[PDB]
Design a protein around this ligand. Structure first.
Ligand code: CDL
Ligand code: CDL
Ligand code: CDL
Ligand code: PC1
Ligand code: PC1
Ligand code: PC1
Ligand code: 3PE
Ligand code: 3PE
Ligand code: 3PE
Lengths: 31, 63, 171, 65, 100, 459, 50, 120, 331
């Protein structure tokens, strides 16, 4: 486990939302 | 777990059975004291106010 | 045994066995079986142990604390006198605790012994219990966990001021 | 699982903003019950002390406290 | 890349090299003697002798004395008609009240 | 008390001159001998406290805390010798020296006849605990946890220093035996209000009070197992000991200064038990359970009736043994699954049946099953708080319901259900682990037979 | 002694017990002087407690 | 505070009236603690130079112990002297000023009225 | 006197002996369930003699054999009340438990932890006879919490099953809610009467006993599955069948009813408490027997049957007929 696999702040840009949706192992449209 | 229970029971009984047998020997042969009034002019020892022999031994030796 | 004065018991009155039926009751046969199988071997082993006690007799004594000066005749902040007074007060407090325990034992033993007519037949024990709990409550209640002889004397002085004021205003 | 536990405990305060909703929920759920039980127990104990110092509360066999 | 670091060592099993491990040490004689020291000096000494020692404390905080003394005092002041306890802890003769 | 201070200091050459494979066995053996010797402090009297010297004494309050303290050292050495097995020999001897030195500070903390000696020893117990947490703690948060542990205690205790030196200048002495006879009433003023706060807030932090407890579920979690044992079993009870000494001087102002803190603790025992219902960390669940149990001890000291002090000292000893055993059970699973997440290792009764029996008994003592001294202390505190106010029975009963709920939820979550499939390093229970569990539980059960030696100065 | 390290803590306890019994001699200003326990001395006895 | 006392005779470490006082015994626990500090200084001195801690430089460890005991003995003599001076000045000032130290009329607790505050 | 008290204590010590046997074992037993069944049969035999010599005279005694503790005015002793209630409930519970264990030797035969099951079932019996023979509220609380914890351990017997763990935690939840009122009653009697002993409670005989009787009604609602605190008992059918048959039909679930019958000299003098018990028992016996009409699991139907009969027992306590209620327990 490392830093970019831990939860972060609230996503505001859609690429931060896509990176978080990749992080939680789920679809961007379902996240 | 069975080895731990065997060792636990062994190391409890190892001194528990001599303590129980020794307390039985004390309470039969040595035995409990009798409540008497203090004789005149006699100042009792501090361990002579206690009833059971082991309590007397504790209050005499340690306390 | 014990002292029959401090733990009183009214005398036992058991009735004679007056059986009406012809079938033998199992209780007498089990009582004879208890006497033969249990009570006589217990009595023999106890007699052996009592002989071993009688081989070497020795005694323990009741520790007599002589009365030291109490807190009222001790000077303020005089620790050598008020220490002795405080130890006297604490021993008296613990003895009064055991007195209330003895009277509770009398009351509960009376209730069980008198059985169903306990409300009538235990009026004297209830009266003694009410009196000793009144005295204990006037003497030691509401002192707090940091109780001392100073607290108890201050409570007594407050109560005696209240009683003197109530007797003064009634005249 | 590590991500869930780190969200549940270790990442809560860095993702906190003191605003209207959080301050009103922190005042209502934080000092609300304290003030409530304070006035309840203060009312009950003032009533009990007033009945005791008037001799009105029946305290006959109360010697354990 | 990132710096020069040893990898995470695997957690050792005490039962692989010693199937009779009591879990104290990987040296088996040290392990068995730690077992005997722990078991003897805790259970055979402190638990057993302390249960005996607490069991035979010489009238711990004088409760038995206080019961026997209270029996003596009640046996006294029943025979003399005195009340079993006064509501005054101290004699009212030896108390000066504040006058009013 | 010098016959206990000197062997505890002689444990230092005993741990530095021992052979390199013998440094656990020798310290365990001789600390068990000191724990055997601790029982001579039961020479207590109904009127007088056992007063040794000008510096040391022991009433019936300090005596059970002393016996628990001297009993806790071999068990900490047993608990902490497996995860410090691969440690350097010098750092291992330093860990054992910090444990021995913390015991050395505690055994003359509880026996301090004079209160500034109590303060010096009381704040001296921070330094080995801080070194243990911030040095042999496992995760990253141990440094922050050491900061919180240090700077809540000193923030609370440096007003206590000014308060005690003020009492030293006013009464002329901080001897507790002299202050039993020279105590004056503390009337209502703002000066005496802040006097009360300065005398009480340090111990409120150490208990911990609800709202000031935030040092605790980081210091108790991020410590190693010996640190968690000593913090849960003795170092919370330093606060209750100091309260029971220092509330001699704070009358009658405590009778209305206690209300906010009684509200904080009566509501904190509800809130921290509710927090225990929703913990994912098992070790944090035991930490908030410790806050929930010490809230009752705070209420019992602040209402200052005899039943409340008896229940508070019984509950302090009972909670020391129970919480130390719960942390040791948590460590026994952490040394196998390497995670403190409670939902990870499940179904462990299918794998470790006798260790699950130890889980069952520690969860039963946690929920105050009679006739354990847990229930004795719990029950006497409930009696005294009912006599305080009749409406506190609602909060006490609701706390007991939530306490049974999180105790058996902990048991069911870790021990029952289907086991976790992908975990296959679940070793059998070592003899060291089961011996540690039994040396916690068996004194806690034997104390139900003769419970009068843990009911304080006013049994 | 081959096992000389096992007499550090027991001799430490003996030494602490000796120093406690020594300090009890320095705290003897009220030996047989307390109003609760003062008494005439028995023969072949010079102090009431040691 | 006491700086006008030791101003008639300046820079005297131990004055001539310090000899009327009993010296500390050489088995003083304070002086034994200072000797323990000498032993600890010897151990730190062997440790910082990476010598064997208990074995190396026993002459040096012994000179540490001896030097700390030697300094601390005179320090304890001056300590006991200055506290004796403090008590001597206290008692002479109380004796010279009886109007400022009245002998207090001590009442017993039968006359002392303390307000009782119930814990209920 | 000597026969009555001796066989009284020999019954309980005989029931505690197989607990020492299962704890001091090294081998696999020579049929330990047969040993515990034989022990409980012989304990039934031992308990029949004080029952017969109660039926002869009405002989009752208190055995306060062991001084345990004295909290300044509360001398807590190990005290055994051998009255009508103990003399009629101990042989009924031993006879029923003997039949339940001979059923258990057949039903629970393929279980590889059968010795633990018989250990747990005997521990329930020991705690229940601690409850029904106790003379003070502390020892009664010991038996009370003991049958609660053995209820937990025997509902969640198949502990891999989620529903068993859930129903056991449910039963602990409702019983601790009843324990709130139990500890309310203990607190009231200690503060206002300075006792936990039943004798001083009955001899002081308080008049303002509304609040302690409300606490006792809450304790019986938690323990005897009355309305509001009822649903743990139908969930409690998740354990094995002899667990249901012994504990949750006949022996454990009558303990709150036994608690309110045990305080009959206080419930006979309080019409408000009698009305509360009457309305609560009628509510329970309506609602649970109404639930039983359309159930399909057989053990749920019999659990709603026994909670309807507990509601009927609470009714007949409420009509100032406590001995009919205790007769209905033993029936
Ligand atoms: C037994 C071994 C077990 C295994 C060994 C290992 C045990 C474990 C390790 C223990 C280590 C030590 C632990 C610390 C404790 C130390 C001892 C102590 O403090 O004891 C305290 C306490 C006081 O002892 P004391 O202060 O020395 O005695 C004071 C007296 O002044 C003195 O009294 P006395 O002088 O008058 O009495 C002297 C007594 C000696 O004293 C003792 O024995 C007492 C000391 C032993 C204590 C052992 C405790 C061990 C634990 C016991 C409990 C668990 C056991 C296992 C499970 C059992 C089943 C449950 O003499 C005898 O026993 C001889 C009489 C025997 C009578 C029976 C036979 C009579 C008929 C014979 C017929 C054949 C011959 C006829 C013809 C002859 C012709 C010549 O002793 C006991 O408690 C003894 C135990 C028995 C008590 C009563 C038992 C029945 C109670 C039933 C009702 C209450 C419970 C109800 C519950 C029901 C369910 C809810
Ligand atoms: C005594 C206390 C002071 C000792 C200082 C020297 C200690 C030392 O060098 O130990 C090593 C030495 C054995 O080592 P070695 O095999 O020679 O070689 C060393 C290795 O190379 C060591 O391996 P390394 O250096 O390669 O790497 C490992 C690393 C490991 O280090 C680390 O990893 C870094 C630190 C880790 C975290 C921190 C842990 C805690 C350490 C500091 C303690 C703080 C708390 C202290 C108290 C709280 C207040 C702050 O460093 C060390 O272990 C260095 C050695 C020092 C360890 C012990 C430190 C002692 C000084 C601090 C405590 C005492 C002073 C403060 C007291 C304050 C007030 C109570 O230890 C001993 O010999 C201990 C003494 C045993 C015999 C005592 C006999 C007493 C006799 C008394 C009666 C006779 C005199 C009568 C006088 C009166 C006549 C009238
Ligand atoms: C001073 C002399 C004293 C002598 C008498 C001693 C008095 C009791 C001391 C402590 C007794 C418990 C310790 C053993 C159990 C823990 C380890 C374990 O699991 O063993 C299972 C194991 C047999 O099981 P296994 O199938 O082989 O393996 C385990 C399974 O894998 C899986 O295991 P499992 O789940 O199938 O089985 C566990 C089972 C699970 O069952 C339960 O957890 C149910 C228990 C709670 C409900 C029932 C009890 C409710 C309360 C009523 C009883 C107390 C008052 C009674 C009086 C009348 C009313 C006032 O628990 C039990 O069977 C425990 C029986 C005794 C229960 C005592 C209360 C424990 C509950 C929690 C605290 C309650 C308040 C405190 C009470 C303190 C009373 C003294 O036992 C042994 O091998 C025994 C080893 C040796 C034990 C020695 C105990 C005493 C040591 C003291 C040493 C120093 C003094 C010298 C005297 C020595 C006498 C021998
Ligand atoms: C102490 C404060 C710190 C706490 C931690 C301490 C850690 C260090 C530990 C040191 C050693 C231990 C010290 C405490 C020891 C406590 C034990 C002790 O001394 O007890 C004395 C108690 C004292 O009882 P007592 O006060 O009545 O003793 C009578 C007094 N004399 C002996 C002088 C006449 O001993 C007993 O009770 C012995 C009774 C016999 C043995 C037990 C029989 C009952 C067992 C169960 C029977 C079946 C019941 C049904 C249930 C079935 C199962 C569910
Ligand atoms: C855990 C963190 C918080 C800890 C809180 C600790 C308690 C809070 C209150 C502490 C007050 C300061 C100590 C008071 C000592 C009283 C001694 C005394 O004689 O008092 C009577 C004296 C009376 O003066 P006197 O003694 O000179 O006069 C004689 C008495 N009369 C007046 C009757 C003639 O009180 C004072 O002089 C002032 C007392 C109040 C001081 C207020 C300053 C501090 C404010 C609170 C700071 C709290 C910590 C903040 C930082 C936390 C960390 C970042
Ligand atoms: C198999 C082993 C059994 C024993 C075999 C060997 C002996 C053979 C037969 C002879 C019997 C032994 C000699 C006689 C027995 C001792 C007689 C005696 O005076 O003993 C002293 C006393 C009798 O009481 P006591 O009143 O004299 O002393 C109490 C002590 N003080 C006063 C200091 C408080 O102790 C015992 O007998 C101990 C046995 C206790 C039995 C019950 C254990 C209960 C276990 C659970 C504890 C928790 C309950 C909490 C709740 C209680 C209710 C509120
Ligand atoms: C009141 C309120 O609305 O405060 C909101 C304010 C932030 O205002 P904002 O919403 O950012 O514009 O937030 C603030 O002003 C900061 C916090 C205000 C006070 C909060 C009081 C409760 C705190 C919790 C107590 C727990 C005990
Ligand atoms: C959340 C974090 C964790 C918890 C930390 C601790 C929280 C509680 C600490 C403080 C407790 C409250 C203060 C003390 C309350 C006890 C009674 C009291 O003094 O009430 C405040 C006072 C009431 O008025 P009264 O007492 O009648 O005034 C005469 C005083 N001689 O009221 C007044 O007179 C008005 C207000 C005065 C100033 C109050 C604030 C300063 C004092 C407290 C600090
Ligand atoms: C090690 C210290 C050894 C000291 C040797 C003697 C030195 C000397 O002559 O000191 C004189 C001085 C007392 O002189 P005094 O007149 O009291 O000083 C007025 C200061 N305001 O004496 C002292 O000041 C003695 C104390 C010195 C301690 C220095 C280390 C701390």
């Amino acid at each position: 486990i490392t830093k970019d696999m831990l939860p972060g702040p609230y996503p505001k840009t859609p690429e931060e939302r896509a990176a978080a949706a990749k992080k939680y192992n789920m679809r961007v449209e379902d996240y | 777990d069975k080895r731990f229970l065997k060792l636990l029971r062994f190391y409890i009984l190892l001194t528990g059975i001599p303590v129980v047998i020794g307390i039985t020997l004390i309470n039969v042969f040595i035995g409990e004291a009798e409540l008497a009034e203090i004789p005149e002019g006699y100042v009792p020892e501090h361990w002579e106010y206690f009833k059971h022999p082991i309590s007397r031994w504790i209050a005499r030796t340690f306390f | 045994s014990w002292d029959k004065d401090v733990y009183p018991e009214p005398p036992r009155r058991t009735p004679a066995p007056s059986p009406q039926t012809s079938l033998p009751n199992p209780i007498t046969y089990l009582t004879k079986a208890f006497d033969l199988l249990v009570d006589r071997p217990v009595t023999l082993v106890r007699e052996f142990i009592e002989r071993q006690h009688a081989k070497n007799k020795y005694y323990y004594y009741h520790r007599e604390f002589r009365r030291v000066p109490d807190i009222t005749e001790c000077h303020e902040k005089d620790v050598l006198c008020m220490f002795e007074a405080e130890m006297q007060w604490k021993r008296d407090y613990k003895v009064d605790q055991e007195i209330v325990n003895i009277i509770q034992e009398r009351l509960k033993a009376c209730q069980q012994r008198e059985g169903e007519s306990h409300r009538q037949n235990c009026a004297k024990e209830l009266q003694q219990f009410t009196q000793v709990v009144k005295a204990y409550q006037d003497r030691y209640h509401d002192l707090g966990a940091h109780y001392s002889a100073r607290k108890c004397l201050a409570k007594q002085k407050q109560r005696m001021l209240a009683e003197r004021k109530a007797t003064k205003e009634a005249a | 699982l590590i991500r869930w536990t780190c969200a549940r405990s270790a990442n809560v305060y860095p993702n906190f903003r003191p605003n209207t909703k959080t301050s009103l929920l922190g005042a209502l759920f934080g000092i609300g019950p304290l003030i409530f039980w304070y006035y309840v127990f203060k009312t009950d104990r003032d009533r009990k002390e007033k009945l005791i110092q008037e001799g009105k509360l029946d305290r006959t066999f109360n010697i354990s406290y | 890349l990132r710096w020069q670091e040893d990898p995470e060592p695997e957690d050792e099993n005490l039962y692989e090299k010693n199937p009779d491990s009591h879990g104290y040490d990987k040296d088996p004689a040290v392990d068995v003697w730690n077992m005997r020291v722990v078991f003897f000096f805790g259970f055979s000494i402190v638990l057993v002798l302390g249960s005996t020692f607490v069991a035979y404390l010489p009238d711990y905080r004088m409760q038995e004395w206080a019961r026997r003394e209270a029996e003596r005092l009640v046996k006294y002041r029943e025979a003399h008609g005195l009340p079993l306890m006064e509501s005054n802890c101290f004699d009212p003769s030896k108390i000066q009240l504040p006058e009013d | 008390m010098l016959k206990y201070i000197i062997p505890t200091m002689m444990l230092m050459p005993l741990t530095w001159l021992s052979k390199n494979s013998m440094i656990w066995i020798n310290t365990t053996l001789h600390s068990l001998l000191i724990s055997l010797t601790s029982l001579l402090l039961l020479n207590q009297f109904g009127d007088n406290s056992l007063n040794f010297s000008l510096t040391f004494f022991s009433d019936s309050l300090s005596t059970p805390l002393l016996i628990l303290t001297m009993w806790l050292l071999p068990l900490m050495l047993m608990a902490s010798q497996h995860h410090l097995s691969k440690e350097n020999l010098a750092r291992k001897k330093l860990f054992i020296s910090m444990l021995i030195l913390l015991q050395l500070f505690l055994i003359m903390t509880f026996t301090a006849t004079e209160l500034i000696f109590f303060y010096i020893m009381f704040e001296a117990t921070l330094v080995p605990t801080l070194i243990i947490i911030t040095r042999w703690g496992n995760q990253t948060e141990r440094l922050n946890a050491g900061l919180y542990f240090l700077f809540y205690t000193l923030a609370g205790s440096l007003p206590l220093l000014v308060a005690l030196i003020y009492i030293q200048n006013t009464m002329g002495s901080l001897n507790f035996l002299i202050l039993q006879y020279w105590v004056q009433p503390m009337p209502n003023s703002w000066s005496n209000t802040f006097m009360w706060l300065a005398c009480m807030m340090a111990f409120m932090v150490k208990m911990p009070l609800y709202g000031l407890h935030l040092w605790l579920p980081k210091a108790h979690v991020e410590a190693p197992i010996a640190g968690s044992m000593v913090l849960a079993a003795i170092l919370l009870k330093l606060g209750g000991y100091g309260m029971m000494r220092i509330t001699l001087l704070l009358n009658p102002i405590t009778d209305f200064m206690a209300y906010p803190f009684i509200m904080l603790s009566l509501w904190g025992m509800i809130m921290t038990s509710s927090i225990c219902l929703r913990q994912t960390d098992l070790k944090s669940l035991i930490a908030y359970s410790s806050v929930s149990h010490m809230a009752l001890v705070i209420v019992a000291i602040l209402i200052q009736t005899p039943w409340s002090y008896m229940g508070a000292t019984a509950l302090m000893i009972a909670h020391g043994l129970t919480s130390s055993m719960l942390f040791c059970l948590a460590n026994s699973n952490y040394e196998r699954v390497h995670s403190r997440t409670m939902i990870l290792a499940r179904g462990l009764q299918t794998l470790l049946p006798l260790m699950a029996a130890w889980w069952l008994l520690a969860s039963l003592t946690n929920l105050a099953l009679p006739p354990s001294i847990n229930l004795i202390g719990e029950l006497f505190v409930v009696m005294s708080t009912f006599s305080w106010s009749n409406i506190t029975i609602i909060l006490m009963g609701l706390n007991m319901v939530i306490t049974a709920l999180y105790s058996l939820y902990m048991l069911i979550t870790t021990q029952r259900g289907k086991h976790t499939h992908h975990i296959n390093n679940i070793l059998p229970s070592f003899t060291r682990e089961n011996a540690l569990m039994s040396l916690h539980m068996l004194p806690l059960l034997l104390l139900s037979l003769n419970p009068k030696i843990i009911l304080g100065p006013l049994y | 002694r081959d096992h000389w390290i096992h007499v550090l803590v027991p001799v430490g306890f003996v030494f602490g017990y000796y120093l406690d019994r020594k300090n009890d001699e320095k705290l003897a200003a009220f030996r047989n002087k307390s109003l609760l326990y003062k008494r005439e001395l028995k023969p072949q006895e010079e102090v009431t407690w040691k | 505070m006491m700086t006008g006392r030791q101003a008639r005779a300046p820079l005297q470490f131990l004055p001539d009236e310090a000899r009327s006082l009993p010296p500390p015994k050489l088995t003083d626990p304070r002086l034994a603690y200072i000797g323990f500090l000498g032993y600890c200084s010897g151990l730190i001195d062997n440790a910082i130079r990476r010598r064997p801690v208990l074995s190396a430089g026993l002459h040096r460890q012994f000179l540490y112990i001896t030097s700390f005991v030697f300094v601390g003995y005179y320090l304890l003599k001056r300590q006991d002297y200055m506290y004796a001076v403090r008590d001597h000045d206290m008692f002479s000032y109380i004796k010279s000023h009886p109007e400022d130290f009245p002998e207090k009329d001590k009442k017993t607790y039968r006359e002392v009225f303390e307000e009782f505050h119930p814990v209920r | 006197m000597n026969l009555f008290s001796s066989l009284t204590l020999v019954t309980l010590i005989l029931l505690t002996m197989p607990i020492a046997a299962i704890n001091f074992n090294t081998h696999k037993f020579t049929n330990y369930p047969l040993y515990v069944k034989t022990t409980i049969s012989c304990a039934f035999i031992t308990s029949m003699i004080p029952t017969m010599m109660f039926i002869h005279t009405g002989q009752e005694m208190i055995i306060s054999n062991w001084h345990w503790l004295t909290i300044q005015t509360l001398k807590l002793s190990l005290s055994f009340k051998m009255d009508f209630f103990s003399m009629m409930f101990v042989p009924v519970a031993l006879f029923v438990t003997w039949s339940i264990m001979e059923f258990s030797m057949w039903y629970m035969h393929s279980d590889p932890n059968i010795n633990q099951f018989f250990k747990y079932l005997l521990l329930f019996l020991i705690t229940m006879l601690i409850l029904v023979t106790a003379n003070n509220l502390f020892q009664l609380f010991i038996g009370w919490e003991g049958v609660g914890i053995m209820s937990f351990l025997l509902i969640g017997w198949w502990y891999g099953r989620t529903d068993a763990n859930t129903a056991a935690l449910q039963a602990i939840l409702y019983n601790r809610i009843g324990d709130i009122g139990f500890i309310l009653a203990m607190a009231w009697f200690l503060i206002n009467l300075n006792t936990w002993d039943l004798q001083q409670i009955f001899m002081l005989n308080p008049n303002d006993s509304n609040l302690p009787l409300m606490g006792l009604i809450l304790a019986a609602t938690g323990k005897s599955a009355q309305f509001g605190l009822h649903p743990w008992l139908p969930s409690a059918m998740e354990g094995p069948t002899p667990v249901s048959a012994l504990l949750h039909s006949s022996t454990m679930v009558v303990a709150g009813i036994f608690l309110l019958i045990r305080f009959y000299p206080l419930t006979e003098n309080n019409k408000f408490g009698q009305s509360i018990m009457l309305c609560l028992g009628a509510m329970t016996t309506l609602f649970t027997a109404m639930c039983a009409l359309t159930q399909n699991d057989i053990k749920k139907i019999i659990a709603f049957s026994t909670s309807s009969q507990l509601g009927l027992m609470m009714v007949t306590i409420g009509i100032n007929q406590p001995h009919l209620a205790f007769l209905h327990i033993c029936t």
